């Protein structure tokens, strides 16, 4: 119940702020703080790159968790999770 399935993309041009498709899990607690974290490592970031995520177009303001409990969903949920250059 901790932890739910995710995998990023984005809609930005750079090249260099491109991850892999690959999905991952990560505890539902996250916010946007905790999943740039995991962003800029997987792009081995000189400087860290503050990101803001969306999944289904929701701008995540809050946990995984909030977002999941809001849409009915249970942590078995695979999530398609967007991140974009902060807004």
């Not at 916010?31 to 995991?38: A, V």
């Not at 997987?42 to 809050?62: A, H, N, Q, W």
């Amino acid at each position: 119940k901790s932890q739910v399935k995710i995998r990023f993309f984005t809609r930005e041009k750079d090249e260099l702020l491109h991850v892999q498709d690959t999905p991952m899990y990560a505890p539902i607690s996250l916010k946007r703080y905790g999943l740039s974290e995991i962003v800029n490592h997987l792009l081995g970031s000189e400087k860290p790159v503050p990101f803001d995520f969306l999944i289904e177009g929701e701008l995540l303001r809050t946990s995984l968790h909030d977002y999941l409990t809001k849409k009915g969903l249970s942590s078995e949920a695979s999530l398609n999770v967007e991140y974009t250059r902060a807004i």
